[PDB]
Amino acid sequence: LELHPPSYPWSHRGLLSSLDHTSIRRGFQVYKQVCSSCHSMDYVAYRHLVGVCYTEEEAKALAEEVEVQDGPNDDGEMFMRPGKLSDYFPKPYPNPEAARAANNGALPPDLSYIVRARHGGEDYVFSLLTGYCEPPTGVSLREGLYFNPYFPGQAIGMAPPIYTEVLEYDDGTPATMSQVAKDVATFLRWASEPEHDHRKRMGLKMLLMMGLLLPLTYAMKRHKWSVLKSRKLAYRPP
Amino acid sequence: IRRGFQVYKQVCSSCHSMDYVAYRHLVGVCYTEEEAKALAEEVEVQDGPNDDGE
Amino acid sequence: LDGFRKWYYNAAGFNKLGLMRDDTLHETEDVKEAIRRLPEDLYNDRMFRIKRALDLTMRHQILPKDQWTKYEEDKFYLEPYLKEVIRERKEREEWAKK
Amino acid sequence: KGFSYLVTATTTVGVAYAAKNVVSQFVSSMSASADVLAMSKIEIKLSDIPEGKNMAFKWRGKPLFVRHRTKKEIDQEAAVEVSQLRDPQHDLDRVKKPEWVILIGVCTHLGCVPIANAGDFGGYYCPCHGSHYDASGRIRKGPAPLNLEVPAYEFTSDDVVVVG
Amino acid sequence: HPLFKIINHSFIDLPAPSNISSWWNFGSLLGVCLMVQIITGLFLAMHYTSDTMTAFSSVTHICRDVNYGWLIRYMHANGASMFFICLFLHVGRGLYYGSYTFMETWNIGVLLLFAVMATAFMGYVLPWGQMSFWGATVITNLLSAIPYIGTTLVEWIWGGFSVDKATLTRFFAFHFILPFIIAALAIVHLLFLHETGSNNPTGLNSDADKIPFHPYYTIKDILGILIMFLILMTLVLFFPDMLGDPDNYMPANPLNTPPHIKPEWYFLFAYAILRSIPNKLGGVLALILSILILALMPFLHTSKQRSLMFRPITQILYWILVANLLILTWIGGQPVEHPFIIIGQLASISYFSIILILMPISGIIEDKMLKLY
Amino acid sequence: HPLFKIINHSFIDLPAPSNISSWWNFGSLLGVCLMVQIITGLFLAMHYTSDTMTAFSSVTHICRDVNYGWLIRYMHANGASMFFICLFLHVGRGLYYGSYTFMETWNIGVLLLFAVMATAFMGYVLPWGQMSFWGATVITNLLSAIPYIGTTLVEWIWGGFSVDKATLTRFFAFHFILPFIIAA
Amino acid sequence: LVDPLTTVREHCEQLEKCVKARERLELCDNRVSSRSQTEEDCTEELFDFLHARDHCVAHKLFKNLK
Amino acid sequence: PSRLYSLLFRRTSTFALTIAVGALFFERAFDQGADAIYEHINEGKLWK
Amino acid sequence: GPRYRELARNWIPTAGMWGTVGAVGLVWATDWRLI
Amino acid sequence: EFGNLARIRHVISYSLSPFEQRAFPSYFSKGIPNVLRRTRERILRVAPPFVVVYLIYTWGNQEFEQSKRKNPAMYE
Ligand code: HEC
Ligand code: HEM
Ligand code: HEM
Ligand code: HEM
Questions:
Q1: Neighbour count for residue A166 (Cβ, 10 Å)
Q2: Burial class (CB in 10 A: 0-12, 13-18, 19+), E255
Q3: Preceding peptide of E339 cis, ω within 30°
Q4: Which residue, by CA, sits nearest to atom 30 of ligand 2?
Q5: Alpha-carbon Rg of chain F, whole angstroms?
Q6: What angle do CA F117, F123, F129 make, to 5 degrees?
Q7: Residues F140 and F157 sit within 8 Å (Cβ to Cβ)
């Protein structure tokens, strides 16, 4: 028994509709300033951004903005260096348990594939992040819990992380809770499928090529099968 | 083989690494189960996370 | 029962391809022995009817309604010849048990 | 004939003996690797769990449920009809301590993890096919064939439990 | 030339019936799908690692860093789905048109079906997601049914107390090696058929009307290949995650279990049957029979007509069989609760009673209506 | 049975010369060796991992922890050596007795010889020892000799600037798949 | 700044379909008030109300959103 | 046009040459045209 | 019928012998100690 | 193989060259009538069963929900 998030009119919902890359950039900013404290985008590395919403040198900037340790040194373990374009996003709580502790038993789930891993993810995400409503009568959430009608059980350890104007969008687009939830849902989506755009272009070329090739192959088949389909049989007993 | 394992244990172990050989492999070759258990419990592991991922 | 058999004969649909009932029998060993014992003209009509039905199924067509096989008209030609094959077949079998 | 065939029969046994041996060693290969067998090790801390709570340490690659029970919890499980139980095993029969119950989390049915603190028997519930286990881990409702297994643990202290 | 002799015999100068419909395309599609799977599987094998620490990481590395690696992975997954679609339609063609009287071809077929199901099961275990691990455990513990031989056998496949790395690696080896055995069994399948030739939808002896295959059923197979490629790509490039499951995008957690667990669509009909029988063993057996009942099918043919083109009552029973097969596919999806269970129990009873009892009795009645019986 | 005919056409009622010596055994031995290799290879594949961090560790785990895993591994290695011994004696029989006048059989043979050499090379790369890595670089470098497209081809096969994990994994896939092509 | 959602919500919220839904929830809320000593809750009522509300909001939140 | 048949379709060799050459250029045209479409459809959303 | 009965009675003894071989074979191969 | 497949007699068979005949003679001219002819010939033997399927499906879903629905008398 769970609330089933509704269908939202996403800009990538259509059959050939790509992602809005400004929204992916804003959602990456939302993840960097809010979501990165507990969740780990393990499978997304700074380099990945180049080509989507940040240019090579631009990405380098972001990369240079983090300290990543280099374990093997002549005699030492870690002089975290300026993270590079080859470095993956920095996971908070190096060990899972660490977070468990920090989040009161909860383990923020790595949001790299969250949208893909959650049924109706994009919607779910938006709903969960925006579904922090009032608990009803009779409910008795355990210590360190909050109430979201969507989350399985309606008892997500995650406290509501998006308060209106939680962070300021560099683009200046008003940082309303929603504008922030929609941006981070687009970004997480991108994260779970960096190739969304490239694919849809392949699908458009595939539809054009099949629309060219199916009637022509049908015409060749009907040529080579007309002979028989016109064959007239006659029985002429002597 | 038992005497040569002693040698490693005392003299050559501090600098060389017998990574692919474990205390389990010795049982039934040079030592019994309790002797190899004592040999393993003399040595100490230092890793593996804890409740704090510690 | 006679009218309901005519309705089932129309619902079976092999008359729309111009086939007889005995054309639709699955060729087992006894059926092939009965077909081999047919006279030449009946065998030739059966092969032409089967070929015409295969051609009509190829073009996904049926015969015009005046050319269909009337239930009353269908002739069970292979039947007489078949019974014998079965009779002979059974006789040999019982004798085997002897 | 008996001389020539005896040689055929002799040879056969020999081949047969080698063939069983070769085939046997391969089957043994697919069997547990020495390392995998070396997992009989395990440790727990009684203080870790308070009454009315379950805890697992993935012992031997499977959830090692370790739970503490309440006066009421312990009271009901005893009240449960052992004979009427799907699997006759009175709560205490599976626990050295009434306040302390330890179980392995593999549904007798198809091997999922029972979910603690859920179900119609205040013990466990397996979201796979609806098997409800009581606090004793006894299958009470559903299609699970037998009660959850109780590993042969060791109560060295009221604070430390070797599961052994 | 020896080879050309063989070539000309199975694909060019092979006498084929002139009136076979588009359903006869499907088996050739299956062969193409097999090659496609093998090719895509080979290009998954150059980057996949069968280690429980690195299997999910290798799959994400394929999707994110290998050039067009997402394309090859989702082509492999949706090609497995397309393989099972074409397999089900091939089996339905064989059931409807009386092609099971080619008994050796039918038995090699049901062996191929068992091999393909085992290959797809271990392949779905291979990405080591949450859903793969709990699916493997569940489907394997099923083997734990057998009283004396079962338990040990399970851990034998599990290669340990519970599925863990030991399993993943041997499942990678099997899943690699079985499609080549499937290809060899398909060669035996083609041989056992050319000895008898293909059947036609009328079910009659088509010896009077046979045509070559090169210009007539080759361009037809090419057109069917093109249409099947249109459906696959439009199920990869536009709807890539339609047939999959979202919980497989989480890493395998032995401590948690996906709340809603279900086999993939193709394995559901069986899933329903298994769940239906109360007894564990009963379920396993019925499950097996579900597939095996087909093999049993050539001994249940009691009609004097091979095909169902001229047999309307057995046509109605056949479409009721397809109907409750779809019902069993739906039920498997539904969770355990009223009234999904009862439907499952009935649907299984109706499935076995239609295949075992109702169709031969109906064939006897149909023979009685034509004054044959 | 239609299948039985094939057996009685290639192994039972096949008319063979009465005077062929023991050298004519060798080709059948090669077929047996092929099966043996495939069987042993399958039982190496249930525990081998094609990762450069874990390939040597998996090979040592096969030799030390899998029950009779040392037996299957050394049977695989010495069966590759036995395969090449029987292959060389088969080719020497074909050269000595004028069997190369069966030209199509000879050409399918030399194709099989090329495939077996490629399979053994990538298989020797597979345990990821010191000798395997330097051996691979060497022969992969052989390709660079190509006058114009050499560099690209080498890099393609390597899958990167220099042999590294990229190679090992694709060499595992190719070494797995080629003995079935050899069987066909 | 006013989150567009609030606006959209208000609109769909004002709808009677929803209003009475909320009211049904209210009766439920009250039931639990008087029937305070029970285990009956209003979760189910809560969800159905929301499903309606959100469905509508969702129908109309993205337009306002930028 | 009967020039086609005589110049392009008639000799298999010629029949081929035209196919290969056309295909060589078709890609250029198809990619270009297709890209124009794709982009426009989502003109607003793309890096630039 | 009677003839097939004679055949069965004549081959069943042989068949039992074959089963016996299998018993030894299966057991020996299974190394089932119960036997 | 061909030549030894079957024995027919006096069955003449006329045909035309592919390039000499229209590729899609009356394709939609008679195709539609025929497709329609065809469907009415099997529709009564195909759809009826699946209709009932849609029905069971629906009834099943609704019934389940009702089961989940809280019993009014429950707790009251
Ligand atoms: C200080 C703690 C904290 C902050 C800040 C936080 N989260 Fe979380 N989040 C969690 C915890 C803890 C969980 C897992 C709790 C659970 O599943 O019960 C979680 C889970 C999630 C899930 C998956 C829930 C599920 O059902 O698996 C999503 C999606 C998510 N968070 C998104 C966000 C977004 C977007 C932000 C900010 C823009 C955010 N989180 C900020 C603690 C946090
Ligand atoms: C590996 C998947 C399979 C493939 C690739 C395959 C392929 C084929 C092909 C190409 C044919 C020739 C018919 C044609 O193409 O027109 C065929 C015929 C047949 N197949 Fe399959 N098949 C598969 C699975 C099965 C299964 C599982 C069964 C049994 C249920 C089966 C039963 C048959 C039968 C009875 C025929 C003869 C029917 C006829 O040609 O008239 N096949 N198969
Ligand atoms: C020799 C032939 C084949 C090879 C080498 C092969 C190889 C692989 C590999 C390495 C994977 C894991 C990578 C991944 O899952 O993304 C995989 C996954 C898979 N394979 Fe195969 N495969 C082969 C044939 C088949 C066949 C015949 C089927 C269908 C029965 C199949 C179905 C699958 C499925 C369902 C998956 C999991 C897809 C998923 O992750 O969602 N494969 N295959
Ligand atoms: C499909 C069948 C085969 C499979 C699955 C297979 C699999 C493997 C695997 C997993 C290894 C790595 C473990 C090891 O070091 O031995 C390996 C190594 C090897 N394979 Fe294969 N193999 C196959 C066929 C062959 C064949 C036909 C040859 C001979 C031409 C061959 C020659 C080798 C060699 C020389 C090694 C390296 C042995 C060593 O470590 O010293 N393999 N094979």
A1: 15
A2: exposed
A3: yes
A4: E91
A5: 19
A6: 130
A7: yes
Which two tokens mark A50?
């180049």
Number of H helices, E strands in chain E: 14, 2
Return d(Cα E104, Cα E295) in angstroms, integer: 10
**CA quadruple D103, D105, D108, D114: dihedral positive or negative?**
positive
Q: In chain D, which ranges are continuous DSSP H helix?
A: 2-30, 34-37, 71-79
| Inter-residue contact F41 to F76 (CB < 8 Å) | yes
Sign of CA dihedral H21, H23, H26, H27: negative
* Cα–Cα distance measured from residue D138 to residue D127, given in angstroms and rounded to the nearest whole number: 16
For chain E, list the strands marked E by DSSP.
16-17, 210-211
**CA pair distance D75, D136, nearest whole angstrom:** 11
| Count of domains observed in chain E | 1
Amino acid making up residue E47: H
The answer to whether the CB of D118 falls within 8 A of the CB of D124 is yes
Experimentally determined by: cryo-EM
Spatial separation of the C-alpha atoms in residues E312 and C9, rounded to whole Å:
10
Helix (H) or strand (E) holding E75: helix E69-96
State both tokens at F12: 């039972």
Residue D40 token pair: 């009989």
G55 in contact with chain A, both atoms CB, cutoff 8 A: yes
CA distance E342 to D163: 42
* Neighbour subunits, A (≥3 Cβ pairs < 8 A): B, C, E, G, H, J
SS3 of E231, please? helix
Q: CA J23, CA J18: separation in Å to the nearest integer?
A: 8
String of DSSP letters for F149-173: THHHHHHHHHTSSSSSHHHHHHHHH
Q: Can you give the residue range of the structural domain that contains E54?
A: 1-373
What is the 8-class DSSP label of residue E266? G
Nearest CA-CA partner of G4 in A181, A169, A186, A23: A181
Calpha distance B36→B18 (Å, rounded): 16
Q: What is the CA radius of gyration of chain C?
A: 16
Query: Contact E117/E291 with Cβ under 8 angstroms?
Result: yes
CB atoms under 10 Å from CB of E29, counted, come to 23
Q: How far is CA E146 from CA A36, E142, E143, E293, F173, in A?
A: 50, 9, 7, 21, 36
Beta bridge partners of D161: D44
| Residue from C75, C98, C79, C66 nearest C34 by CA | C79
Note whether D127 contacts E: Cβ–Cβ < 8 A. Answer: yes
Which amino acid would we find at residue F83? F
Do E328 and E269 touch, CB atoms closer than 8 A?
A: yes
| CA-derived radius of gyration, chain H | 17
How far is the C-alpha of E140 from the C-alpha of E123, rounded, in Å?
Answer: 14
The sign one gets for the Cα dihedral D116, D122, D124, D125 is: negative
The CB density around residue G22, as the number of other CB atoms within 10 Å, is 18
Q: Under a CB-based contact definition with an 8 Å cutoff, are residues E105 and E189 in contact?
A: yes
By the CB < 8 Å criterion, does E97 face chain C? no
**Which run of H or E residues covers position D100?**
strand D100-104
Neighbours of C26 (CB within 10 A): 16
Specify whether the CB–CB gap between A111 and A39 falls below 8 A.
yes
Is there an atom of ligand 1 within 6 Å of A101 CB?
no
Most B CBs within 10 Å, among A97, A100, A103, to test the B interface:
A97
Name the packing angle between helices E165-194 and E26-45 (round to 10°). Answer: 150
Inter-residue contact A53 to A21 (CB < 8 Å): yes
Phi-psi region of E261 (alpha: psi -120 to 50; beta: other; left: phi over 0): beta
What residue ranges in chain A does DSSP mark as E strands?
67-68, 81-82, 232-235
Chain B hits for A96, CB-CB cut-off 8 Å, are 53
Cα separations in angstroms, E197 against E18, E29, E105, E194, G64: 12, 18, 11, 5, 66
